[PDB]
Amino acid sequence: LKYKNLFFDLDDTIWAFSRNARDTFEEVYQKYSFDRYFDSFDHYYTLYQRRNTELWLEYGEGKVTKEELNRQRFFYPLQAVGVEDEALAERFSEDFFAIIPTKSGLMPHAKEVLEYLAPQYNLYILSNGFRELQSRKMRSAGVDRYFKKIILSEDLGVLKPRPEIFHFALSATQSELRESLMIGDSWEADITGAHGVGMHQAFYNVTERTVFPFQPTYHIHSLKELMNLLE
Numbered sequence: 001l002k003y004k005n006l007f008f009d010l011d012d013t014i015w016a017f018s019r020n021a022r023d024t025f026e027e028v029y030q031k032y033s034f035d036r037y038f039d040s041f042d043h044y045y046t047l048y049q050r051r052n053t054e055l056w057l058e059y060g061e062g063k064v065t066k067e068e069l070n071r072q073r074f075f076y077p078l079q080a081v082g083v084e085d086e087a088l089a090e091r092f093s094e095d096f097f098a099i100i101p102t103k104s105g106l107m108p109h110a111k112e113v114l115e116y117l118a119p120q121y122n123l124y125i126l127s128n129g130f131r132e133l134q135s136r137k138m139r140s141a142g143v144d145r146y147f148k149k150i151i152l153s154e155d156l157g158v159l160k161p162r163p164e165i166f167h168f169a170l171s172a173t174q175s176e177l178r179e180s181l182m183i184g185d186s187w188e189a190d191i192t193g194a195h196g197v198g199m200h201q202a203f204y205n206v207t208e209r210t211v212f213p214f215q216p217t218y219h220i221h222s223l224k225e226l227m228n229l230l231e
């Protein structure tokens, strides 16, 4: 086999982050009777997402700390509707973090695909997500067992797509570059990052992307395609 090491992103590649996070935010929204402050959950969540997206970029650029990232992203939607209650935002975030890692939703066919690949490849996670969440998410969903090691941006202090985290992931796992494949849903973090260091990439397209500044090594629309690609 050409590849010996498969590096998977976690969120929206293996774990159903968008689905699981929407469910969790809605549960916490309802718990705190947020219809008092917003027209609907979607009024809340669209505001939350707009700022959260901006914030994760600032974080990757070293413009906010993880702590400031978290403080701002749960407070932003409340202050956007005139609620200046920072303590309420903090209680909300505590409940979000208590619940999110308990969710078990995976991307389609993930368990089957991982069970198929595990005997034949070293399987790794390469993720920017929080150490106190990532392995818990994986256990809850029953997929932690497939992965030999989890490599986090927090291990190094550098987020995808910066090159350092990819070179670190290779060394940390005794992996040769030419024997490694990055599999992920983020064009900007996973595919651009891996391409940047000369590592092959399989772009898992769940955003209906049609425009490519460069072509990924492989372009798949289902994790099932991995079983065919890497048979």
Ligand SMILES: [Cl-]
Residues within 6 Å of the ligand: 009, 010, 011, 126, 127, 128, 129, 189
């Ligand atoms: Cl990530």
Ligand SMILES: [Cl-]
Residues within 6 Å of the ligand: 138, 139, 140, 141, 142, 143, 144, 145, 146
């Ligand atoms: Cl597990």
Ligand SMILES: [Mg+2]
Residues within 6 Å of the ligand: 009, 010, 011, 012, 013, 184, 185, 186
């Ligand atoms: Mg992802």
